Amino acid sequence: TKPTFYVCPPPTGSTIVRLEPPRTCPDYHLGKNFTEGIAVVYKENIAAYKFKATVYYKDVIVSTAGAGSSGTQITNRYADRVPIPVSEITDTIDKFGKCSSKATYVRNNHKVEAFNEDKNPQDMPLIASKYNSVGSKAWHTTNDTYMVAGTPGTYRTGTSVNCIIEEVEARSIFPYDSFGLSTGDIIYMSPFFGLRDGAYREHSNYAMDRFHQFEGYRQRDLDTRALLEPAARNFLVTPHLTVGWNWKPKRTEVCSLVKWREVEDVVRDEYAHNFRFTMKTLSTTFISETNEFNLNQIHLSQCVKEEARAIINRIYTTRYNSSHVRTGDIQTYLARGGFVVVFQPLLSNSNRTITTTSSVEFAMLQFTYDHIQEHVNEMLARISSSWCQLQNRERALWSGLFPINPSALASTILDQRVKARILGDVISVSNCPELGSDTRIILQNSMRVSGSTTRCYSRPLISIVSLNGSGTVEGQLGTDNELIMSRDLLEPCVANHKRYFLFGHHYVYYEDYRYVREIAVHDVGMISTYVDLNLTLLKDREFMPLQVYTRDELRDTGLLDYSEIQRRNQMHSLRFYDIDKVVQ
Amino acid sequence: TKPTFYVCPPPTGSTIVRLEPPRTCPDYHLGKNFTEGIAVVYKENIAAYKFKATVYYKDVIVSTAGAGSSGTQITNRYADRVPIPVSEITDTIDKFGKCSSKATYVRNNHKVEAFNEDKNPQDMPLIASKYNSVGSKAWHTTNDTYMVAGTPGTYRTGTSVNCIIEEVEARSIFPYDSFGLSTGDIIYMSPFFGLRDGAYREHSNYAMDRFHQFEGYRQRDLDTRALLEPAARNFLVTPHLTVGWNWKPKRTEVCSLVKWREVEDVVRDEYAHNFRFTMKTLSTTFISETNEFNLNQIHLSQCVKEEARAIINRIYTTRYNSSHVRTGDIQTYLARGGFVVVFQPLLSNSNRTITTTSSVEFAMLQFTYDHIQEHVNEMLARISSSWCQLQNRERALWSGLFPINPSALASTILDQRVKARILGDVISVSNCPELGSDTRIILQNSMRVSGSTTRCYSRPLISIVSLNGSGTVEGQLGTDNELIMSRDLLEPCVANHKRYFLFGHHYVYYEDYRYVREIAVHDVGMISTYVDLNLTLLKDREFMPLQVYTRDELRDTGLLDYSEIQRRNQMHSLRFYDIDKVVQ
Amino acid sequence: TKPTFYVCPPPTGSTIVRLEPPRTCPDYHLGKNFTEGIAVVYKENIAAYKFKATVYYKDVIVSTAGAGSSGTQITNRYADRVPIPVSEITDTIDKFGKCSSKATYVRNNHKVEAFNEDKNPQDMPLIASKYNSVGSKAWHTTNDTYMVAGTPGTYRTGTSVNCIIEEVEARSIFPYDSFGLSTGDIIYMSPFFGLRDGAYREHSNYAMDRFHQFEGYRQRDLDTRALLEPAARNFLVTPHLTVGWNWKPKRTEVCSLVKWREVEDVVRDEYAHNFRFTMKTLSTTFISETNEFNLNQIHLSQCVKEEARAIINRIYTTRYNSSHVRTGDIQTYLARGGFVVVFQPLLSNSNRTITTTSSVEFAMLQFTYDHIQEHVNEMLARISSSWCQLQNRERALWSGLFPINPSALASTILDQRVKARILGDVISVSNCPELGSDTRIILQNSMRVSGSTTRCYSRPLISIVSLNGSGTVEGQLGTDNELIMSRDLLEPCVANHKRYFLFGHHYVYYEDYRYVREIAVHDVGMISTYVDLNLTLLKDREFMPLQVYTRDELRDTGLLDYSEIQRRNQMHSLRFYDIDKVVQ
Ligand SMILES: *[C@@H]1O[C@H](CO)[C@@H](O[C@@H]2O[C@H](CO)[C@@H](O[C@@H]3O[C@H](CO[C@H]4O[C@H](CO[C@H]5O[C@H](CO)[C@@H](O)[C@H](O)[C@@H]5O)[C@@H](O)[C@H](O[C@H]5O[C@H](CO)[C@@H](O)[C@H](O)[C@@H]5O)[C@@H]4O)[C@@H](O)[C@H](O[C@H]4O[C@H](CO)[C@@H](O)[C@H](O)[C@@H]4O)[C@@H]3O)[C@H](O)[C@H]2NC(C)=O)[C@H](O)[C@H]1NC(C)=O
Ligand SMILES: *[C@@H]1O[C@H](CO)[C@@H](O[C@@H]2O[C@H](CO)[C@@H](O[C@@H]3O[C@H](CO[C@H]4O[C@H](CO[C@H]5O[C@H](CO)[C@@H](O)[C@H](O)[C@@H]5O)[C@@H](O)[C@H](O[C@H]5O[C@H](CO)[C@@H](O)[C@H](O)[C@@H]5O)[C@@H]4O)[C@@H](O)[C@H](O[C@H]4O[C@H](CO)[C@@H](O)[C@H](O)[C@@H]4O)[C@@H]3O)[C@H](O)[C@H]2NC(C)=O)[C@H](O)[C@H]1NC(C)=O
Ligand SMILES: *[C@@H]1O[C@H](CO)[C@@H](O[C@@H]2O[C@H](CO)[C@@H](O[C@@H]3O[C@H](CO[C@H]4O[C@H](CO[C@H]5O[C@H](CO)[C@@H](O)[C@H](O)[C@@H]5O)[C@@H](O)[C@H](O[C@H]5O[C@H](CO)[C@@H](O)[C@H](O)[C@@H]5O)[C@@H]4O)[C@@H](O)[C@H](O[C@H]4O[C@H](CO)[C@@H](O)[C@H](O)[C@@H]4O)[C@@H]3O)[C@H](O)[C@H]2NC(C)=O)[C@H](O)[C@H]1NC(C)=O
Ligand SMILES: *[C@@H]1O[C@H](CO)[C@@H](O)[C@H](O)[C@H]1NC(C)=O
Ligand SMILES: *[C@@H]1O[C@H](CO)[C@@H](O)[C@H](O)[C@H]1NC(C)=O
Ligand SMILES: *[C@@H]1O[C@H](CO)[C@@H](O)[C@H](O)[C@H]1NC(C)=O
């Protein structure tokens, strides 16, 4: 309980002030030039090129067995896969669905031969393998591996020739100098090698006499026994097999870029000296330079422009035909992360390769930040602008009310207890020091004027007693604990006089110009001019490196791992034999 | 320096206005119906099924050597892996820890045999390989590869049989029609094939006589020489090895879904016609349809419901037992990205497969945007609501103060210099045009009234001189550079008269009703009614496609790459020989 | 159209209130202690160690051919790769660029030999393979595979020995106990095995006599025929090849951590009991414990401290030399996600392994949330602070204007129609009930006072008629539809009297103290004290699990898949033969 009182000497012209004129209201130069449009986004093509081929070979197996007392012992099993010559394929397999039981091939630089069962050659019917199914089909001529034992003491040799044709899956990866077959065999020729249309400049590691190409060739369907439709067919004979595949030109088969997403609602704007492609349907934003990117700098990029045009046309005439018009030709941009943006601008009526990143998350982040930034910026700019207009409006209240109570308004603006006077169009102020220690303040009981019955004091009389005996002042209780050094606040005595005057931390209650009681300030109910506004803060948050699958998991999805099998199995000599022991 | 003055004709009833009544305060219908709960989130299981098996085989190696003058030359080395028959495994390996030095097998459709060292069969002790360690263990019967040279001019043949048993790791991937062994061998039978409990309908590519199953079988621990515990054991004999493994039913061994995260604090709400699962402990939000998802549409999904229940029970009775209650049975939902949400609703006291995406980042983005949106929306709604209440409160000030200075308040509201009068409950206004060119304004020195000593002008006298000679008006200086066309602002002459009046861009200072000096407006200190508010904007930001490991890096972690080894090594014939040369 | 009127009994002292004093303005204790700095961030090294090696072997191929009537048949082709002994490499290959046409090796625990063309040994020149190119180079001694047929009825055997040297790529993965060669061969020795500097404690599975190390060894460049520069060279002879490589110590060759990013602008602060490393140039934030992390707990982490120092020095003296100073030695922290932060604090003038996560997105999220949080928090705190100051300033208007119209101000604050009086420093209020049903209100035409010509009513006379006959009151029309129960609002009659008084939902127009017409409130133009503020909300947004490449795509980039090749090709016996058929 510490009551502070004030004393207010009259204002000399020592300190004159004026009310600050209205402020110029802020301007945030938001609003950007944009352009609506359609986009097709492309990514680096990382997928192998896939096609169908057929392998033609013979399993040749030569076995030497010795018969003994106990039984038969195999002394040698020489197994070899040999290519079926093109002549056999064209004149026997594809005409009759048969294959010779004699293998005719070269090995160790010699023309050599082998006869199934060591009998005279017959053209054997090609029969579907029992595991044939939709997917992988194959045909063969025997189920047997001919070998002959004979009578004890002797070594006999027998030959097995099994003529085999498999349909296989072929794969090739950029730059397409070779292809791999699902038998494990690698073919060191481009899948696009041929004799027409410059295709003879494709890569190959084989002498030309191993390669054959037949226009309008007709392959036999071994199951239906019928001829399939004519197509240019390649045959290449390698030392272990012949491969056959239907030739297609490279131009129509591979592309280094592939469609990632076609995008109907796109807005492009100039943003930090770049182009920004905001795609609200993907919650994704891509950023390129303002310069178009020339796709001709990229190997095999021909598919993109044409395919993009067709897509964009489909878009335009389906959802934009009435509403917008195209304002130029298509444009192409290289976005951050290695994405190719193919952009068609609209208007409403009113030699490298590209490496594409593995995640578009950064571009979703980019979108999410931009969206939030744009929205809170626009809202902050409105608050800011409205606040300014509000202060400027309210100045008129301050200015209009100032003559009614200059001291009270000035004291609030200056955050300081002052006395103020109006001097024409200007305010004159003076400081009201706090009443000091060693002073006592006595409240007088009567607000009546001595010797009058019609004239009263409008506020209580007080005497200010110096406790050290300097003197006593006869003043009155002003407002807000101000003490006035005179008694010139007077009024006509009213009937039914009831007043509460603030006195320190109490209200002091008078009736009929006489003191009645002291009341605690806290005993008087409050009403509030304060409009509540309760703003709280965004709290701290820690994001964890959440993963769906670890790197270990993602490498643990396959049947076998090559390196693991090799590590374990090349030990075999070391684990089960002594490689260091030498018999003398 | 350009001073503008105004002239204000009295308001006719031509333009009467009223003060806009209080506005209805905005309502943002925020607040959503939610439901607390517990969740277990599942993901597509991509991991191979892993189990232990044992392989039983014999290395058979037949060598033919010729002795010469110089030394010995190996002419042939025929090597073959042969299966150990089940009878040998059950009656010799598992009873005695021994294996016959004679291999008895079929090859080329013939029963054939081989004798270690070409001697009579003995049951050889199985001995641990020197590389045995925790991890991979194996046993064998010899360290030698028997071969015999003999005397020059002759060819001798010798046989090595080394009986080998390895513990191996087995792997199988969905749909579990086969399994791969760490020897590289593929077994074309389900690991779950057996004779009991429908297991005989599992896939197999082998004739039944190759398969054996023994209930309560007891395998011998070759190292401790003791019998291990009884279990149903499979044996399958293939042409190169016999495999043994302990059979377990499929139901208990594999599941197509696997636990990703159990989640204690979950809130579900209806959000854009969907269910939203906000998980503040993961900073992650998942979104499904409101319809439950029936797990029975998914192959091998039985593990999920039971495991989830047990987990959820653990959660409930450990941290929620006192505080909440379960308000139903468990529910299951399919969330965006291929996550299965198993959700238990709470209340406080008061045939396909599923493909799961590789990243949950989108769901963390989803969380982060939602959290930010919810918070700034709620705060914007409070600002907006408080602002409205504030304008409505302040209207009372405008209305109450209006009779004191109608012109000044109206001029600020209309942003236009007007003169206003109160006509009862209505405001009457008129426009105050700017004083034009070709006019000069002379300030009179004296504010005293001619012929009086008790009566004065309350503001300075001015004469308005038309510079073209139209006439002179005798008026006075009003407020804010208004010029009044009369001289009826009068007051009793006070003592100590000091006034500053605004006159163009100067204050004009009078004392005792006489002009004293001109003072520049900028020479008078300001006090401000403007409460400062300094809001700045979120700045532009560019996010880069940051990667930890590129695709190249992630494929560069293994010892060998299969395709690379093949590309390089199938060239071998081409690189070091001439395959095209034919000797005649 | 429902007009409500009020009646206001005079306020007794029953309800006295006071104006709430100014509120203490909120304090948000924002502002954090930070420290500027430089960082180098490290990640788990997952890349294989790569080096160059050379393999030395001989292809030995023994062929037996039988001549017949028809032609030649190959009966056996025994092929073997044999190691070239170190003596041959040091004394013949590296001195003369030649290799013996005789292979001398061990197999089946016997010293054995082979002669190219079965002729006497010659030292054959090593010749570059025709496929030699920048990348992979190799040399050999013959292009032929010698074999001999002879005359019919006979079997002849011939031997081919082709001496081969290839440059290969070598790979090793942690913990570096072995290495893989690009021929497919695994070498079961550390690439860092040697005889110096403790290197003899590295792993090896080979007897020591297979290993050789030569200090200052000089390898021959087979193409230039010149000796290369001296270096410590290892040779290891395995049963199929000899490997040669230039030895380097492990310390300088491998590290378990690798630089991810050097970072110039870094700010560290204490945040949720942790250290926060905000990196505005990466839009990425990392979080560690406040405790430094001791790198000595990690295998092979020596490269980090030294390399980091050098990098940081480069940074400091290039961009910070004048502006800041280093305030300590370098510090190292383990951040969430498995990143190692190497941090150098600045001041302006004024045994495990670490697993690093695959994505830094969470740390970009962390940055983006922090940045947004910091900015809207700081702005909310300013709004909140300015709002409070504004209410406190405006209280002075409420307080100063209160004596002019206590009822109107109190009615707005209390949101209730009250009558208020000032009783000294306190407000006395009373409720003004709505005028009830069954009452009719008649407006009197004349505001003139009967019997006077100089005295008038200041507002219209009204009579309040009880429709049930309780009586009539003669009062007047107060403000805002208040009805006053007396007629004591009087004024001197003015000239040109024109007033509009609100009466229900009409204004009622008087001239010269006489009624003239009724005017609809909506016919009187409004001016507004309401400053507009239009805030809208962030809208709902759904983020989709966007992927650039699916898991399928990322596994579809290679030429061949090992598991696929094996699955398909180990069927071969089953698909094209009958393995179950036994010939008797
Ligand atoms: C090497 O020897 C093998 C045998 O060891 C031999 O394999 C046969 O290969 C032929 C193709 O050349 C297969 O014929 C196909 O059979 C398909 C249906 O197979 C299922 O049903 C069989 C029921 O009997 C069929 O055949 C018999 C006569 O044998 C006949 O009476 C019936 O009407 C019926 O047609 C059944 O035997 C078979 O069982 C095998 O597969 C199961 C899989 O679970 C396995 O577990 C068994 O152990 C067994 O191996 C199976 O259940 C049939 O759909 C298919 O038809 C296609 O082609 C025809 C044209 O002919 C089209 O009309 C039709 O639309 C289809 O496209 C085809 O006919 C035959 O099944 C094999 N035999 C065996 C025992 O499996 C090889 O030919 C020999 N090779 C050489 C070089 O000689
Ligand atoms: C084919 O020939 C090979 C040899 O060329 C032969 O290999 C032996 O295989 C047996 C198992 O059959 C191995 O025995 C194991 O040895 C473990 C400890 O090995 C370390 O210590 C050895 C020290 O000598 C041991 O043995 C000698 C007698 O030889 C004895 O005096 C000692 O007390 C001691 O027991 C040491 O030789 C060995 O060195 C090899 O490995 C190092 C690795 O750095 C390599 O660099 C060397 O070049 C060398 O190859 C190594 O340092 C032992 O812990 C283990 O015990 C397990 O089983 C027993 C039961 O017997 C349990 O009681 C125990 O808890 C363990 O589970 C086991 O005894 C032996 O080491 C091999 N010998 C060699 C030279 O390595 C094969 O058996 C032959 N195979 C056939 C078919 O004949
Ligand atoms: C096994 O037999 C094969 C042949 O079947 C034989 O292969 C030769 O290997 C030698 C190296 O030992 C190769 O020599 C190299 O040739 C490089 C240029 O090759 C291109 O140009 C050739 C044009 O003729 C060259 O040689 C002739 C004489 O033959 C000469 O007149 C010319 O001036 C010219 O030098 C051309 O033959 C060759 O064609 C092959 O490759 C194409 C690729 O498209 C393929 O399609 C063909 O079918 C054919 O296989 C090719 O176009 C040359 O740059 C290189 O030079 C390097 O080394 C020298 C040092 O000698 C440096 O000075 C120089 O800076 C380079 O570093 C090198 O001279 C030769 O090309 C092979 N021959 C053939 C036919 O390809 C093996 O040697 C035999 N091995 C054994 C053990 O005997
Ligand atoms: C008492 O105090 C007053 C002011 O507080 C001072 O002016 C005066 O000198 C003091 N009187 C005595 C007697 O000390
Ligand atoms: C001078 O100007 C006044 C108004 O500015 C105009 O009314 C008057 O016609 C002018 N007088 C002459 C003589 O042109
Ligand atoms: C008429 O109404 C008044 C107040 O509305 C009530 O006091 C009075 O009793 C009523 N008079 C009659 C006759 O019912």
Atom 18 (ligand 2): residue with closest C-alpha? B130
Contact yes or no for B493/B453 (Cβ under 8 A): yes
Write down the residue that tokens 């909120």 correspond to.
C26
What's the CA gap between A579 and B413, in Å, rounded?
106
> Closest Cα partner for A125 from A103, A145, A99?
A99
Dihedral angle computed from the Cα positions of residues A514, A520, A523 and A527, in that order, rounded to the nearest 10 degrees: 90
How far, in Å, CA of A218 to CA of A223, rounded? 15
The residue written with tokens 């005295």 in the block is: C455
| Longest Cα separation, chain A | 165
A1-4: list long-range contacts, CB under 8 Å, 24+ apart: A1/A505, A3/A481, A3/A504, A3/A505, A4/A434, A4/A435, A4/A481
Return d(Cα B68, Cα B47) in angstroms, integer: 58
Q: Which amino acid is at B268?
A: R
CA distances from A126 to A90, A131, B108, C576 (A): 14, 15, 21, 11
Does residue B500 contact residue A426 with C-beta atoms inside 8 Å?
yes
Among A214, A102, A121, A221, residue whose Cα is nearest residue A163:
A102
Q: Which of C227, C197, C187, C194 is nearest to C212 (CA)?
A: C194
Other C-beta atoms within 10 Å of A520: how many? 9
Residue ranges of alpha helices (H) inside A402-489 are 406-413
Q: For the stretch C416-446, what's the b/e string if a residue is b when 16 or more beta carbons lie within 10 angstroms of its beta carbon?
A: ebbbbbebbbbbbbbebeebeeeeebebbee
- Tell me phi and psi for residue A268, to 5 degrees: -100, 135
Helices (H), C97-243: none
| Joined tokens for residue A245 | 């595949």
Residue B519: exposure state from Cβ atoms within 10 A (0-12, 13-18, ≥19): middle
Contact B401 C404 (CB under 8 A): yes
Taking a C-beta distance cutoff of 8 angstroms, is the pair C217, C232 a contact? Answer: yes
Give the whole-angstrom CA distance, residue C159 versus residue C60: 7
Counted residue by residue, chain A has a size of 584
Cβ-defined contact of C543 to B271 (cutoff 8 Å): no
**Measured CA angle at C16 (ends C12, C17), to 5 deg:** 155
Q: For residue C298, which of C246, C257, C353 has the smallest C-alpha distance?
A: C353
Q: Are B353 and B338 in contact (CB under 8 A)?
A: no
Residue B156 has phi, psi (to 5 degrees) of: -115, 145
Q: Which ligand is nearest to the CA of A467?
A: 4
d(C-alpha C518, C-alpha C502), whole Å: 10
- How distant is the Cα of B384 from the closest Cα of chain C, in angstroms? 7
Task: To the nearest 10°, report the CA torsion of B328, B334, B336, B337.
Answer: 130
From the list C13, C404, C569, the residue facing A183 with the nearest CB is C569
Q: Quote the ligand 1 centre to A130 CA distance (angstroms).
A: 6
Token pair of A159, please? Answer: 């030959």
Alpha carbon B380 to its chain's center = 27
Closest-CA distance of chain B to residue A539, Å: 10
Beta carbons of C425 and A140 less than 8 Å apart: no
The whole-angstrom separation of Cα A563 and Cα B561 is: 7
Tell me the longest C-alpha to C-alpha distance in chain B: 165
Q: How far, in Å, are B29, B182, B184, B187 from residue A569 at the CA level?
A: 70, 8, 8, 17
With contact defined as beta carbons under 8 Å apart, do A255 and A303 qualify?
Answer: yes
Which chain C residues are closer than 8 Å to B210 by Cβ?
580
Beta bridge partners of residue C217, listed in sequence order: C231
Q: How big is the CA angle at C298 (ends C292 and C300), to the nearest 5 degrees?
A: 125
Nearest to C426 by CA among C56, C13, C38: C13
Taking the CA of residue C297 and the nearest CA in chain A, the distance in Å comes to 23
Is residue C300 within 8 Å of residue C256, measured between CB atoms?
yes
Straight-line distance from the first to the last Cα atom of chain B, in angstroms, rounded to the nearest whole number: 116
d(CA B358, CA B340): 14
Residues of chain B with a following break (C to N over 2.5 Å): 350
* Of B393, B566, B567, Cβ closest to residue A531: B393
Q: Which ligand is nearest to the CA of B468?
A: 5
Q: Which of B205, B195, B192 is nearest to B238 (CA)?
A: B205
Atom number, ligand 5, closest to the C-alpha of residue B468:
1
How many whole angstroms separate alpha carbon C139 and alpha carbon C133? Answer: 12
Q: How far apart are CA A147 and CA A157, in angstroms?
A: 7
**Which chain B residue shows the shortest CA-CA distance from C570?**
B186
Pocket test for ligand 5, best of B439, B465, B468 (most atoms within 8 A of CB): B468
Interface A–C counts its CB contacts (< 8 A) at 333
Contacts of residue A217, defined as CB under 8 A and 6 or more positions apart, other chains included, come to: A230, A231, A232, A233
Query: Three-state DSSP class for B161?
Result: strand
Query: Closest ligand to C464 CA?
Result: 6
Position B223, amino acid: D
Contacts of B47 by beta carbon, 8 Å cutoff, 6+ apart: A553, A556, A557, B258
Separation of alpha carbons C68 and C149, rounded Å = 9
* Method of structure determination: X-ray
Contact: C583, B110; criterion CB under 8 Å: yes
What is the per-residue DSSP string for B445-475?
A: SB-BPTT-SSEEESS-EEEEEETTSS-EEEE
Specify the residue with its C-alpha closest to ligand 3, atom 68: C130
Name A158's bridge partners: A63
Cα separation, B118 vs B106, in Å, equals: 19
Q: SS3 of C278, please? A: strand
Q: Which residues, numbered 301 to 340 in chain B, qualify as contacts with chain A under a Cβ-Cβ cut-off of 8 Å?
A: none
Do the Cβ atoms of B47 and C557 come closer than 8 Å?
no
Helices (H) and strands (E) in chain C, counts: 8, 35
Q: Which amino acid, one-letter code, is at B174?
A: F
For residues A419 and A9, is the Cβ–Cβ distance under 8 A? yes
Q: Where are the beta strands (DSSP E) in A68-137?
A: 72-83, 98-100, 102-107, 110-115, 123-125, 127-128
* Closest to B47 in 3D by CA, of B298, B339, B257: B257
End-to-end C-alpha distance for chain C, whole angstroms: 116
- Structural domains of chain A in order of their starting residue, each with its CATH number: 1-13+433-525 (2.30.30.1230), 14-33+357-432 (no CATH), 34-47+253-356 (2.30.29.100), 48-252 (no CATH), 526-584 (6.10.250.3280)
Cβ neighbours of residue B487 closer than 8 Å, sequence gap 6 or more? B457, B461, B474, B475, B476
Give CA–CA dist C406/C399, Å, rounded: 10
Nearest CA of chain A to the CA of B8: how many Å?
A: 19
Q: What is the CA radius of gyration of chain C?
A: 51
**Does B440 contact ligand 5 (Cβ within 6 A)?**
no
Q: Ligand nearest C143 Cα, by number?
A: 3
C-alpha C420/C-alpha C414 separation (Å) is: 11
| φ, ψ at A357 (rounded to 5°) | -65, 165
Q: Does B23 touch chain C (CB under 8 A)?
A: yes
* CB contact burial C315-334 (16+ within 10 A = b; e otherwise): bbeeebeeebebeeebbbbb
Cis peptide leading into residue B175 (ω within 30°): yes
* DSSP structural state of residue A210: G
DSSP class of residue A388 equals H
B273 to chain C, any CB pair closer than 8 A? The answer is no
Quote helix, strand, coil % in chain B, to nearest 5. Answer: 20, 40, 40
Q: In 10 A of CB B38, how many CB atoms?
A: 26
Query: Ligand 3 pocket by C-beta < 6 Å: which residues?
Result: B 578; C 127-128, 130, 140-143
Q: Which residue's structure tokens are 């302040």?
A: B394
Cβ B38 vs Cβ B343: under 8 Å: yes
C-alpha torsion A515→A517→A522→A525, nearest 10:
-80
Closest CA to B361 of C278, C284, A356, C360: C360
Given 3-state DSSP classes, what are the helix, strand and coil percentages for chain C, each rounded to the nearest 5? 20, 40, 40
* Chain A residues lying within 8 Å of C400, measured CB to CB: 401, 404-405, 408-409
Give phi and psi for B98, each to the nearest 5: -125, 160
> Counting beta carbons within 10 angstroms of the beta carbon of residue B479, is it exposed (0 to 12), middle (13 to 18) or buried (19 or more)?
middle
Q: How far apart are CA A285 and CA A276, in angstroms?
A: 7
Q: How far apart are CA B147 and CA B58, in angstroms?
A: 17
**Residues on chain A touching C564 (C-beta within 8 angstroms):** 182
Q: Which amino acid is at A541?
A: R
- How far B327 CA sits from the closest chain A CA (Å)? 30
Contact of C137 with chain B, judged by CB distance below 8 Å, is answered with: no
Say how far apart CA B106 and CA B100 lie, in whole Å.
Answer: 16
CB A452, CB A44: distance < 8 Å: no
Distance from C-alpha of A401 to C-alpha of B462, rounded to nearest angstrom = 27
Whether A437 lines ligand 4, by a CB cut-off of 6 Å, is no
Instruction: Judge whether B416 is closer than 8 Å to chain A, CB to CB.
Output: no
Neighbours, chain A (3 or more CB pairs < 8 A): B, C
Amino acid present at A120: N
Give the H or E element holding residue B363: helix B361-401
